[PDB]
Amino acid sequence: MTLKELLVGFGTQVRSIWMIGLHAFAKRETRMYPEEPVYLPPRYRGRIVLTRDPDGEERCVACNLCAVACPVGCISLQKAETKDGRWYPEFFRINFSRCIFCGLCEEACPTTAIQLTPDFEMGEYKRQDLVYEKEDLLISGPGKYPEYNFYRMAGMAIDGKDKGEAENEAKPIDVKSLLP
Template identity: 90%
Template sequence: MTLKDLLVGFGTQVRSIWLVGLHAFQKRETQMYPEEPVYLPPRYRGRIVLTRDPDGEERCVACNLCAVACPVGCISLQKAEHEDGRWYPEFFRINFSRCIFCGLCEEACPTTAIQLTPDFEMGEWRRQDLVYEKDDLLISGPGKYPDYNFYRKSGMAIAGKDKGEADNEAKPINVKDLLP
């Protein structure tokens, strides 16, 4: 080992100690998570929830578009029908251990029933606990769109009533009347 190698090694050690000393007295970047809130961007996609319409009914009409749009296939549901002709999911299941929170299910939903919230605390001890059923996903409020009611806007025929004749339903628009 030459004197030059010793001086280079010594210089490297001194430089390393100097950098450690500089960083030791600077403000820390670590956030103390439970005590300090975490900043989430406005479009953060977190926990998936099922919402209700302003009347308190489920918004989901079990159209299965969310399950088809999901790239990993973590959504499964079964359609059933009320006496008045409205569809609803008999069961609705999301496996959050497979979900990649891409938001495609929210975009595909025609009734805005599926919405992604800014909640990210979903840690569980067992993998089976990450499979959420409809009761776990359904919230009591309308979510991001409080005034939207799919059956009012869609003009669907329900239980022997023609389009636009159901209670509190808008009449269908004739698009030919809109032409000049």
């Protein structure tokens, strides 16, 4: 090979050594998990929870839209009803060994009950323990949507909210009323 090529190669090797040393004399870019907590954005798609309304009841009306919107089919729930007539899930289970954390169920929820939270630490020893039942999902507060209540919009009458007491609803008028 050419001697000029050898000199240029030696110069660029010296430059590589010097710039790697300068990188060594630079500041570290390491986020020290778990001593330094990982910053997650508020809309990060991690562990799935079920939330509650401002009134404290569970927000899920067991409408089965999240389960059908799931492209993996890892949501299973059954609808039950109380004496006053409100709908709730009898059970609600999610196979987290199957969930791809895509957020389509949160997007499909018409009550903002199911939510994906900034939490990624979900490792497990047995795959049977990755099936999260309703007691592992329902949290004590509203989560990312702090004030939405579906039952304040629904026309279906429940406890504490009679007919005509929802938003943008007039009081019921009997057909036997004297007014024309």
